[PDB]
Design brief:
Distance between the termini of chain A: 33 Å
Largest sheet of chain A: 8 strands, mixed
Subunit structure (chain B): Homotetramer.
CATH class of the largest domain in chain A: Alpha Beta
Oligomer: part of a larger assembly
Shape of chain A: globular
CATH topology of the largest domain in chain A: Alkaline Phosphatase, subunit A
Family (chain B): Belongs to the alkaline phosphatase superfamily.
Organism (chain B): Trinickia caryophylli (Paraburkholderia caryophylli)
Number of helices of chain A: 14
CATH superfamily of the largest domain in chain A: Alkaline Phosphatase, subunit A
Largest interface: A-B, 69 and 69 residues
GO molecular function, one term (chain B): sulfuric ester hydrolase activity
Cofactor (chain B): Mn(2+)
Structural class of chain A: alpha/beta
Radius of gyration of chain A: 22 Å
Strand content of chain A: 5-15%
Order of helices and strands of chain A: EHHEEHHHEEHHEHHHEEEEHHEHEEEHEE
Helix content of chain A: 25-40%
Bound molecules: zinc ion
């Protein structure tokens, strides 16, 4: 009996940019993703999914280890992932699968096990040990640019200028002008061709493949025709306080980011404050973001076609997800940082082999990126490792939400200094005191900071997190309650590596409950 | 020439230190002349706690500088991941031989030793990274063989040496001596190993962990210590109306009242730990002081040798206990649960030379995890990045650093081990069988992972009888303490590699 | 300031197929290698280089760890390489260089660090830990066949039938017909393409690249026009004994190989004994073999072009070599097996940076495959690891053969049973007794078997190893001496990982001599 797994991981794709969910609420989608729509219609779409941390580094450690950031300790980009942790790659090998990966993991190696001069200590990060690279973005995007260059397209002196907007009158920033690279040499095409190459090599033998897409990560410019596909005026408006300073008044960490986030990190060549973008420009960006999205969908179309032609579609567990979200103007922020819901809320669509008993349904239960790894391993016939914080989602594909499933969503962020951003200057704390965790449900959200003020939100009254109730004596019992939940969640999720073992007079044994 | 002598007694309560009784205006109800010497020449810390219980957790913390939340040796019989740097490994790194006497009750790491390994057969064994120079060993064979080799005839069942004298003497709280003379006591044994080690060193610099088993039970003493102290001159137990009144406070208290047995505290006895009368509890307390005095006599022997050989003034001497003991407080026997008497332990530090703070009594909030950093940096080393604890040296200089902790912290995990199954009582799986405590001079907040929490007003209710955590009027305070506890957890997440960075320039490191 | 190493490693390319050396000897070359000729013209050609063991797995382990087989213990294909041993990848990372690699290493993993179900324990071998893979043959050649499918070429049901000769009923075996794959999709073009991709991605940044070719490894069939590039009539005749049995009678190990080697392992779909190929058939094979070589040369052309275009040629150390030789019908043998010189004799050409001071010259010092790794590491500024048996060749590019250079060549072969061949059933020995070592110089060769008769050859009279003297009482003193040399070698090359260390009153110390 052949079983395949296709993990599709996009980067920076928000939860609320999924047509199938828009349609269930009664809205007409403002973008098109027909191939995703097929996955959706044929599988289970998760409405309330979060990555348990951001940015890419931490988010991928959580995704590829089943561990919360509090256990995996890859707290930011550039911070080492301890190699004691069992990653998805190493686990799949232990059950006979070859862990093929396309994309990147943005992982910083363990310094105890590699030379200080290792080139990998020179970039944000590199591919996690334990996977087989079959199409790397590679440090500095070299895999891609080499591939562009070997395809006979002549790149500019400064290679990233392929993402300047086209035409010698066009200002960098939000744009309706295409990029300077053709769609047949887009990074999304690059990864897709690597998938097709790999799958064709396999020639019907069972596979695991992590298919990583860079998009819709910035820079926010798209190859033709995706640049003009959608109109600014059809995009939803950003949700924000009256001006950048009103937003900044909420919390010191909010202020650092409002005061520090640059347009140049989201639009190639652009200059100035991300927070000072006007509504018109955010709308345009947003439409470019929709283009990038639809290109991925066109791309998934090719991968699905090859599975159909080779009779593999019904043999394959396809999971579609993102590593993290993106502010996209919400609360005057660009990117993924801080405590706001849009940075953590990501899509999850799972299509079982065969005809899916819940095909087309929308699951409301609270899932977390740490759940993916246990799901895959259980589905391929293996055990969920003891150390994992996450739990297999497979019951959702069966009877439904287990009776003891989590009742709140959990996520974390660590803002200690790295080489390109120094929150600690703004916040005046040392690195071991720069974190927060979040506890959220249908009615409230509590953000607790290691050593700064807490935030509490009535999501019925204030669903966009504008009014901190945390200092209001009238809410003492409620904030108590949520602090207590958060505390119990920590206690219950201390490291589990060896805590199930026991010496006894009858020798070493294991406890299963 | 710098020496370190770490005396770790077992089960010795914070509030059985004469020096502190005297400062409080009381007449010591026991005598510890030698420890009294240390306190007079040194600093006594009055608010010191072990960050967990029982003996393997407490010692993992003590010997790694890590809270239970990071060392994960959450109970006796639960393995200690060997990734964690221990005191002995650290000492070797700064050129000290980590000589150890007694025991650490450490369960080894399954990933680095065979399942058939004999050490997975006992509660625990000496920790990797030390030089054993006098092992209680597993099953206490090191001691027993020493008794046998000294020519003392042992009974069929060896532990019957701690049956009380006389074939008509009732096992239990007893006024009769043990069936072994003091010259073959376990405390005499450990002391003889200590003296052998020290004399072998012949003046060369030294680290030594001098472990004693006492006042661990059984609560029975060699002559004359059985009689030395009187049950009429002991402090009364502080407890509720009856077992059930106390049981009713919390489901874990119920578990322990309902299950602690007398045989775990007096050899061959049986019946319930909770149902001892105040008369019996006081007799027990008399035996305990006896065993305490016997340790003091022993340390006299070890201190004497230090004086003779000119080493006393070079030797950082640290006196402490792995954990406390209820002694019938709250109808409990042992070191379990959340009550302060299981966690409050002694700490007395005598520096080299003349002590700037000789005889003084420190009030700052110290924790067992601080001991290791203290030793290491005293001998010229660094405090490892990974340690939750902090060096105590500033207290022996100018005093409490302006950024010292303002609360005490301690944890307890009560998952099923092979001789007690609290999961049956409280109906939780193992990963939810834990609590942490957060305590200052005014309140204490005991938070459970999956049972109702406890909150006490320490002024009005210094002995933890009236849970206030469900009083709506207390919402804001109970929040505050959950809030502190939550910040402590966040702030004390594992730090092994979280200080490193990659950069355009290569691998670097943040100090702050 | 800028320093590149390109290590080119071909497979099964004999040392006596190097035009530069043939011209030096006075012979008109029977094949063409202009691009290799350029390296020779500009660099140093070593006429007496050997691989210290065969076949692929073991030879590569030696090449890439600097260790003799007596120390790396990867004694055959399928046998694990202990990971305690430090390889080229790991060394390079420790001096700041990315260990990019193309091709394959056929390394069996270390079972103590990897699960028993790891799919890498299912193939002959896979890529060695420590290298970055930027162009894998992959297990099964999937990487290549994936790249052919994706180029739009329609592969047969049994993919490997691309190497059946052209035509409805051309007889498999030594052939003059082309293969059924166009040259634009040959394996040689695949490895090349991946090379160019890699270099184009680097974009001037210093690099290390292991550029591996599969050719001229069998099957012996070539894409058009390489199939008819050379004529049987012009190919050197095989050197062999009068008949197979006569060859067999020299030693039980030879007899086992004569009796078991099949034409199918060298011509795809062929049947019969490789031993029984007549000389016409062998000459045909030799011609096709030259076919594949010149295809490689053509390919090195494109790579050298790109270094020339980009101004990198003068900044690049280029080392050209092979993992092992090939009997190519000599002694009635096909493959790389036993003790004969042609299985071990391999090419080495080294072009230093700048204008080489020994350009064109031919070095005669005895070099071994183990010396390559130290050479590269010293040239890049690092140190020769203390464990290495090999020694740096850079003095040859400076003043010349060091005054204490080895005075003999050493190589080894272990013939314990593997899944696809079982010499233990022929020679009746247990696996720890199934080895030989060779010691050879310009005048004598000694072959020492662990548990079979030894062999001794006078190479002036009998340069082709036909007349074993080892049992002639008149050579007892000479055999003694060579056995004594062999013994002294074993003793002086015992594992050095930690033997330079000492405890002392002062603490831990190191002894440099
Ligand atoms: Zn990302
Ligand atoms: Zn203890
Ligand atoms: Zn080979």
């Amino acid at each position: 009996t052949r079983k395949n797994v296709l993990l599709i991981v996009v980067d920076q794709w928000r939860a609320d940019f999924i047509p199938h969910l828009m349609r269930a609420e009664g809205r007409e989608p403002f973008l098109k993703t027909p191939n995703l729509d097929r996955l959706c219609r044929e599988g289970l779409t998760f409405r309330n999914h979060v990555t348990t941390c951001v940015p890419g580094g931490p988010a991928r450690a959580s995704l590829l280890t089943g561990l919360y950031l509090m256990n995996h300790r890859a707290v930011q980009n550039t911070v080492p992932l301890d190699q004691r942790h069992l990653n998805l790659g190493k686990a799949l090998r232990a059950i006979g699968y070859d862990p093929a990966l396309i994309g990147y993991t943005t992982t910083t190696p363990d310094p105890r096990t590699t030379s200080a001069r290792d080139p990998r200590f020179t970039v944000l990060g590199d591919i996690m040990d334990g996977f087989r690279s079959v199409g790397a973005f590679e440090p500095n995007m070299e895999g891609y640019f080499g591939w562009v260059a070997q395809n006979g397209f002549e790149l500019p002196e400064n290679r990233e200028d392929i993402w300047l907007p086209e035409g010698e009158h066009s200002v960098p920033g939000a744009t309706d002008k295409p990029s300077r690279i053709p769609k047949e040499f887009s990074d999304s095409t690059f990864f897709t061709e690597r998938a097709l190459t790999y799958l064709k090599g396999r020639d019907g033998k069972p596979f695991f493949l992590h298919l990583g897409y860079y998009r819709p990560h910035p820079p926010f410019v798209a190859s033709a025709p995706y640049h003009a596909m959608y109109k600014a005026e059809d995009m939803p408006a950003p949700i924000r306080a009256e001006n950048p300073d009103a937003e900044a008044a909420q919390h010191p960490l909010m202020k650092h980011y409002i005061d520090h986030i640059r347009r140049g990190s989201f639009f190639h060549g652009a200059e100035g404050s991300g927070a000072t973008l006007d509504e018109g420009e955010i709308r345009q960006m947003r439409a470019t973001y929709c283009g990038l999205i639809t290109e991925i969908d066109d791309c998934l179309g090719r991968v699905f076609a090859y599975l159909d032609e080779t009779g593999q579609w019904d043999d394959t567990l396809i999971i579609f997800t993102s590593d993290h979200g993106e502010q996209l103007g919400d609360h005057h922020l660009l990117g993924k940082i801080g405590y706001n819901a849009e940075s953590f809320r990501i899509p999850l669509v799972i299509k079982d082999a065969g005809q899916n008993r819940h095909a087309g349904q929308i699951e409301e239960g609270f899932s977390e990126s740490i759940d993916v790894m246990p799901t895959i391993l259980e589905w391929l016939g293996g055990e969920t490792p003891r150390a994992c914080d996450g739990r297999s989602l497979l019951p959702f594909l069966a009877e439904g939400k287990p009776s003891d499933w989590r009742t709140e969503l959990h996520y974390e962020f660590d803002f200690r200094d790295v080489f390109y951003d120094q929150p600690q200057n703004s916040v005046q704390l040392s690195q071991d005191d720069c974190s927060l965790c979040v506890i959220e449900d249908e009615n409230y959200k509590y953000v607790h900071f290691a050593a700064l003020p807490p935030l509490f939100f009535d999501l019925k009254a204030d669903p966009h997190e504008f009014s901190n109730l945390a200092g209001d004596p009238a809410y003492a019992a409620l904030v108590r309650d949520y602090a207590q939940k958060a505390l119990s969640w920590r206690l219950s999720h201390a490291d589990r590596t060896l805590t199930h073992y026991r010496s006894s007079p009858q020798g070493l044994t294991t406890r299963n409950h």
